[PDB]
């Protein structure tokens, strides 16, 4: 139903709409994956997240924006940052919007989440379709997607059809 309802790009129909499990590291970290177009239908995404993926509406919502450049993180700042973010997310049971690209601040965020995971925080990674390491691999069926590749920790992935990278 999603493929017919959602069309991902001049213009291209449907495509993608297949979850991939990142069985590269210690944790497989099964997650959803859908490649939406640049234009988005709020109702479609809301229904897909709430109903198709069976995710309860959170009492809190967080949107995080950071630079794509990869830089070292200060130890003292990161120690407090990761713990506080994990505690707040667990207490609120809230969705976290983050970039789907591993490179950049997201990387540290995902690592921090991983170090604080082992709550089943329902994150949402949104990254350009072009940034995907192996766009053709996804092609709806489980995909190995050996571990630029997207972060494995984030779940409920969405992507935009930006054409050329």
């Amino acid at each position: 139903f999603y493929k017919r309802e959602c069309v991902h790009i001049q213009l291209s129909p449907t495509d993608a709409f297949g979850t991939i499990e990142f069985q590269g590291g210690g944790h497989s970290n099964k997650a959803m994956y859908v490649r939406v177009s640049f234009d988005t239908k709020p109702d479609l995404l809301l229904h897909l997240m709430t109903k198709e993926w069976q995710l309860e509406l959170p009492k809190l919502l967080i949107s995080v924006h950071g630079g794509l450049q990869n830089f070292e993180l200060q130890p003292k700042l990161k120690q407090v940052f990761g713990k506080g973010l994990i505690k707040a997310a667990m207490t609120t049971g809230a969705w976290i919007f983050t970039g789907g690209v591993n490179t950049g601040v997201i990387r540290h965020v995902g690592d921090a989440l991983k170090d604080h995971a082992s709550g089943k925080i329902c994150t949402i990674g949104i990254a350009p379709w072009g940034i995907v390491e192996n766009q053709e691999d996804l092609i709806d069926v489980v995909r190995p997607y050996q571990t630029t590749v997207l972060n494995s920790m984030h779940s409920h992935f969405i992507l935009a059809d930006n054409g050329t990278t």
Binding site: G24, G26, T147
Partner: protein, 343 residues
């Protein structure tokens, strides 16, 4: 005496390993120590030296390194004598980069030695040296750095070499570093692992000789059909081995895509067969359908202990019988209890 010692050390360092590294440590000392530093640097490129807090020649070399390249007057005051000292000080300061530096950062002397050796050797070689030293910390801190070249194909060979040895923590580090058994393992690799005699001794050869019941070549190559037969012998009646199957036999004949769907099972079987407890526990941790293979391991270890007790063997069976099979049985029981608790 001194010349003979230096020549013998240099000759020994040339022995194939690749080459055995050499590190020199200096605690203060007279000007002869400084001349020895210069001679060691000149003799071979790999002559790292570590300075010590002890006052004396070591203090002079540390001051020269700190100055790198007023100062001349201070050096002369500290020291014809000044000119003689400067004649060696110029070389020491010029080549100060190669020489290691120690102070009261880098508090750990062992860490300083490891870093100095890694820098002097000049990273497949660094990873190999760390594995040889059996030190995961140095490899993680030093061998693993962003932008590492990591040539394609050598890492798998290093993984195989580690598997041959009992460096379980190194295997864990490689797995956490992105080394995947899912694609690495191949039929030939598993055959080599089974046939290799390196590492702790195992009694598999005795069992194979007993099973075949026919004259066999000395140190004859051990194939997977034979190990399947041995597994059938030990496991008990019925329960045909997966190795001794028609489809696998067809695959084996064609080969000699050669990657097992459940490599953890075969790796666990191999580890238990060769009497390696820690590897078996780790592979039990990470595999799938763990309880089944835990029970299989308990049964197989009990069979091995009985077989060893029956003929010849040593007291090691007592260590195995009730402390290898028993451990797996208890693990399976605990897993069952937890599963019942949850649902």
């Amino acid at each position: 005496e001194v010349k003979l010692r230096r020549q013998l050390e240099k000759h020994i360092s040339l022995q194939k390993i690749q080459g055995v590294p050499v590190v020199a440590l200096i605690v203060e000392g007279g000007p002869n120590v400084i001349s020895i530093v210069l001679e060691y640097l000149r003799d071979t490129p790999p002559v790292p030296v570590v300075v010590c807090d002890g006052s004396g020649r070591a203090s002079d070399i540390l001051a020269f390194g700190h100055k790198y390249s007023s100062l001349r007057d201070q050096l002369l005051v500290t020291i014809t004598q000044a000119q003689h000292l400067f004649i060696i000080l110029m070389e020491c300061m010029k080549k100060k980069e190669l020489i290691t530096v120690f102070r009261m950062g880098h508090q750990d002397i062992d860490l300083a030695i490891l870093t100095a050796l890694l820098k002097g050797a000049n990273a497949p070689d660094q990873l190999s040296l760390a594995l040889a030293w059996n030190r995961v910390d140095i490899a993680r801190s030093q061998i693993f750095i962003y932008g590492q070249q990591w040539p394609v194909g050598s890492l798998e060979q290093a993984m195989l070499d580690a598997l041959v040895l009992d460096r379980v923590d190194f295997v864990k580090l490689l797995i956490e570093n992105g080394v995947s058994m899912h694609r690495f393992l191949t039929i030939s690799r598993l055959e080599e692992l089974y046939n290799t005699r390196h590492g702790p001794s195992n009694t598999l050869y005795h069992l194979v000789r007993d099973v075949k019941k026919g004259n066999l070549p000395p140190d004859y190559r051990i194939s997977l059909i034979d190990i399947g037969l041995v597994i059938e012998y030990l496991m008990g009646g019925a329960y045909r081995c997966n190795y001794t199957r028609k489809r696998f036999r067809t695959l084996y004949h064609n080969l000699f895509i050669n990657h097992f769907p459940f490599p953890f099972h075969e790796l666990m079987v191999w580890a238990v067969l060769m009497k390696r407890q820690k590897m078996a526990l780790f592979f039990w941790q990470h595999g799938e359908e763990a309880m089944a293979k835990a029970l299989v391991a308990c049964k197989l270890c009990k069979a091995m202990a009985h077989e060893a007790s029956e003929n010849d063997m040593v007291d090691d069976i007592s260590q195995e019988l009730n402390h290898n099979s028993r451990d797996f049985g208890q693990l399976a029981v605990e897993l069952l209890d937890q599963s019942y608790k949850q649902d």
